[PDB]
């Protein structure tokens, strides 16, 4: 039974991921920041399924919280096999009106946070000479998007970072890959607001917004599949056709 | 039970693919060109497993053979759900000594053949408003490789072609993706010869050549997964770190 | 004074390229297939400018014509410094209605022709331990386009091919790069017809179709610049924002 | 005469860029952080050439300094036509031993600094409905590199950011492109130390390290060429063959 750490597992994509790895019987550390109750329900579901779960409230943009989150999984089970860096937020605004704080917040969490988590997981994984790290980026990091210079910067940064992380870990058998989802129905997407959501829908060749379960399916393949042990330093896009 | 057509399924990657989709209980048309006996054994294995199989000898670079191959699956089962365009060959030589026939043969099979197969599958899939097409390319189509201008051209061509194929089929719900494998141990690779095979091995970050089963695993995800229904027009690389 | 061979130099982009390299004083072989008169006028203009020019009617999809075209420049001047593989055509149609002849014609010229020309130039360039080859592809080879599976395949193929060509020539100091233009106003584009041309115009972030001179400017940099001697195996896109 | 602002113009690439745009007669704001004397000499050279120059000491990772740097060019000449975001540093170390301060410093300058500069230039350029922004990234942002997770993250981030910047500015006719150099002989590269520099040299197909003038040549094309007005949201690589 693999030990999986999923950041931002209380809602949306991270939650679908957590439930799916639980249903496959993994030991899952469900991290949350503010949604304690929602994480607990996730833990309970994983359990009803036969997986094992421990909830952990911590801000992944803070080193202390990150070192603590890893410690909790290691104290509970003996190691960490997989880490899915999913936590993220948006602070949308045209480049011309963007406040430095809007830039910093997105960068601190979405980019630096992924660095902290990856670094922490890696030190543990090096010793065991095995592990998998999956970072959730976005198609926006690839093809940009109006009103999202901050988010685009952070997501693109996750990709360049994951590639070096892949190179450094190759020696100790640690796979590092990135998943780039397109428009997925979640709370993050509910914020851009309906008339806009519809607008985006005519932009998607497959004419359908993706579901959190769609991403989880792909993450599950990368995390558990024996085949995926030969995949590193790559970005995998599930976007229904946007970034063709 | 999905009906899957796999070209070049008598040996290497196509065979691993055929066996794996059979073990999952699909109805598999195992195509072969010259290895009749080896295809039959594949058919038998699929059967021992509980999948269904029909062997079909045909050259996929010929329209007639292609239209015939599709007909045989349609006469047998009622439709085709998935087509995996795997058949391919190499005719290596420096650009400076390359004969037009060495260029043509690689192009006719590896590129035009994929066009023929995709076109044929698509006409059938459009009517049913559903289907998945997976084309096997190569990392060489992405980053080139000395002694393989012909193969690089054809493989890169498969990618551009698959992207348009993805756009045209999006409307009728047909997913088209490409898989780009790195060095995989097979008969194709056995031909470059040992001292060379070793040389290539120090070029692979994960320090391991891939196995046909590694590719099959990924193809199986793309062919069968509900998650993969949201993936189109993308190239997926399994190369142990070469093309990072 | 560099000797430059430009294929398809009688009209559109190839012509703008020919005129611009002539105005910079190069010796230019202006190739044409059917537009003899238009090539002659190009030759005359180059001359009025102070460059030197020789017209050559030949089909670049034929080996004989290609070997002949190279011979003519070599007999005239002592060598070839730059080759710009520009000749190309389109045979648009949905994948579902595409005749094999429509596929073949686009592939024979746009892909194989580039192989023939590059191969011929390379054998000459290897001996001199210097040279530059610039292949004109298209943004379509990168992001696909409905109604152009053939063209997309050929253009993408040009890219993979150019990358291997770059690797093989690196040793003898031969640079090989690709230029990918977006929508450029020319006879090729006049064929898609007005209501369509307007439609495409709202797709271009810079809201302007490109001009043949725009491409020539970039080709001139790659062909003549001392800086461009450090650039190989790359694709350069001038598309006013389509493929961001 | 275009007004060009070049960040980090006292040494290496930024300096070659400054000299070259000066020799073409632009008005150049040469920014520096600590090398006041070296910037002055650059200013003098530009002048001996017939260009115009004003030196400006400021840290481009600070908003105040950035707003001040723009003000100085605007007070001097009436506007800004081109901004080249060149300033950058490295803080190399394996991911496993990387201090948060080593991460932050590289991110603050190389990524956030580019945001500050681009934002400032853009507000000015929007009003004039014209301008060009060229951000210097690195091939490392594309293909990663051991010991440089921080730098790779920042450089990749510059690319995603530049793409959104391109989209937002398209409307007001502002071009935004990125240049990705490979190994260039400069003080930045002198720091990795000789036995390493030699090692890297056998990795370069063209078997030559690039020169600051090579990058300047390409930047000059993008900054001044009428042709480059049709180029946006793209990354241009000069790396002698590394990232093929
Ligand atoms: N939705 C899309 O269309 C789309 C497209 C591409 C990529 N993505 C990416 O997918 C990931 C999740 O997508 P989403 O749509 O699922 O968003 P969401 O519904 O808003 O969920 C974000 C999650 O992040 C957690 N979180 C926020 N700040 C955190 C912090 N400082 N530390 C630790 N956890 C934190 C939240 O937990 P609490 O509520 O408990 O605080 C929450 O579970 C993000 O990386 C997002 O960028 C989404
Ligand atoms: N091996 C690698 O490292 C690698 C890396 C990247 C991509 N790939 C690709 O993977 C696919 C298969 O790999 P491989 O290594 O499996 O090669 P392989 O062991 O040589 O098998 C090639 C297969 O193609 C079939 N075939 C050949 N010509 C055909 C034709 N004209 N029509 C129909 N079927 C034909 C052969 O069947 P018969 O013997 O019955 O004639 C055989 O089953 C190819 O597309 C290859 O390019 C391989
Ligand atoms: N126009 C665009 O928007 C666009 C976008 C991307 C790429 N491109 C590419 O740019 C190149 C030229 O563009 P274009 O728009 O300039 O097209 P064009 O105006 O139709 O000109 C094509 C040229 O090719 C020559 N040619 C045709 N067949 C030939 C053959 N078999 N052998 C030798 N020369 C031949 C023609 O010469 P003759 O008339 O004398 O026969 C003509 O000068 C092509 O590779 C095209 O794919 C164009
Ligand atoms: N060298 C390469 O191989 C290579 C490869 C790819 C990309 N690049 C990029 O090229 C750019 C320059 O390359 P380089 O090799 O030229 O480096 P360099 O020789 O070390 O020069 C860096 C420059 O940045 C300036 N600078 C440093 N910190 C600054 C700050 N906070 N604010 C404003 N200016 C600052 C320095 O000025 P002062 O000394 O006056 O403080 C100096 O002129 C960087 O973005 C680097 O990443 C270089």
């Amino acid at each position: 039974s693999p030990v999986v750490v999923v950041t931002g597992a209380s809602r949306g994509i991270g939650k679908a991921i957590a439930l799916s790895l639980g249903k496959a019987g993994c030991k899952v550390l469900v991290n949350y920041a503010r949604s304690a109750k929602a994480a607990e329900e996730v833990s309970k579901q994983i359990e009803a399924y036969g997986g094992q779960a421990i909830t952990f409230g911590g801000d992944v943009s803070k080193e202390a919280d990150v070192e603590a989150m890893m410690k909790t999984a290691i104290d509970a089970w003996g190691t960490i096999d997989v880490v899915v860096n999913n936590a993220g937020i948006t602070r949308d605004t045209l480049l011309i009106r963007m406040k430095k704080s809007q830039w910093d917040e997105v960068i601190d969490l979405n980019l630096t946070g992924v660095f902290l988590c990856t670094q922490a997981a890696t030190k543990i994984m090096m010793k065991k000479r095995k592990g998998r790290i999956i970072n959730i980026a976005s198609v926006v990091g690839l093809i940009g998007n109006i009103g999202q210079a901050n988010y685009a910067a952070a997501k693109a940064g996750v990709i360049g970072f994951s590639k070096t992380a892949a190179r450094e870990g190759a020696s100790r058998n640690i796979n590092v890959n990135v998943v780039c989802p397109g428009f997925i129905a979640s709370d993050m997407t509910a914020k851009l607001g309906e008339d806009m959501e519809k607008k985006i829908l005519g932009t998607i060749p497959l004419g359908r917004t993706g579901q959190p379960e769609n991403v989880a399916g792909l993450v599950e393949f990368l995390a558990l599949s024996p085949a995926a042990s030969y995949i590193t330093g790559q970005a995998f896009t599930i976007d229904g056709g946007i970034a063709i």
Side-chain angles (χ1 to χ4, degrees), chain A residues 1-22 24-33 35-36 38-39 41-43 45-126 131-194 196-197 200-244:
Chain A
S1 226
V3 165
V4 192
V5 173
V6 179
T7 73
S10 47
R11 298 200 285 180
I13 293 158
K15 162 195 193 153
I17 293 171
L19 288 174
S20 95
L21 302 177
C26 303
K27 300 168 173 99
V28 189
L29 177 321
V30 359
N31 155 258
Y32 68 84
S35 315
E41 292 168 24
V42 163
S43 283
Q45 247 151 159
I46 286 169
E47 256 151 21
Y49 278 146
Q52 274 177 257
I54 300 181
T55 300
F56 180 87
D59 179 346
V60 307
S61 67
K62 297 142 131 156
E63 238 222 296
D65 295 20
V66 167
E67 297 188 340
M69 172 181 67
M70 299 306 180
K71 182 202 193 180
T72 129
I74 276 185
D75 291 346
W77 312 298
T79 185
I80 298 170
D81 300 303
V82 183
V83 168
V84 179
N85 288 314
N86 167 89
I89 58 166
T90 58
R91 290 302 187 251
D92 294 357
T93 172
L94 291 180
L95 176 55
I96 231 60
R97 310 175 187 142
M98 194 157 102
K99 304 170 194 259
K100 219 236 178 214
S101 73
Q102 290 170 301
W103 169 266
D104 288 343
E105 292 171 9
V106 166
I107 300 297
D108 297 350
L109 208 215
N110 301 10
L111 178 55
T112 307
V114 164
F115 154 62
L116 294 170
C117 292
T118 297
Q119 177 183 235
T122 292
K123 310 207 335 210
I124 287 157
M125 287 165 180
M126 294 258 155
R132 295 183 191 196
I133 302 166
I134 303 164
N135 297 331
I136 313 290
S138 165
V139 123
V140 170
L142 295 173
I143 83 190
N145 191 36
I146 290 175
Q148 310 197 292
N150 46 359
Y151 186 76
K155 295 302 204 187
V158 163
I159 297 163
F161 171 70
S162 306
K163 291 187 153 125
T164 300
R167 301 193 177 264
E168 293 192 11
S171 246
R172 306 298 187 118
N173 208 226
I174 306 175
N175 301 257
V176 183
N177 294 292
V178 174
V179 168
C180 303
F183 175 157
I184 289 107
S186 82
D187 287 337
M188 187 162 104
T189 244
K191 37 181 247 165
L192 57 77
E194 181 159 350
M196 185 57 162
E197 292 192 12
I200 301 203
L201 192 57
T203 256
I204 311 171
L206 288 176
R208 169 191 342 154
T209 47
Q211 299 298 322
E213 301 92 49
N214 297 149
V215 181
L218 171 52
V219 172
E220 170 168 19
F221 170 77
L222 291 175
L224 275 17
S225 184
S229 57
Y230 202 58
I231 305 184
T232 7
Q234 291 295 323
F236 286 67
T237 302
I238 350 101
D239 66 351
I242 323 269
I244 292 167

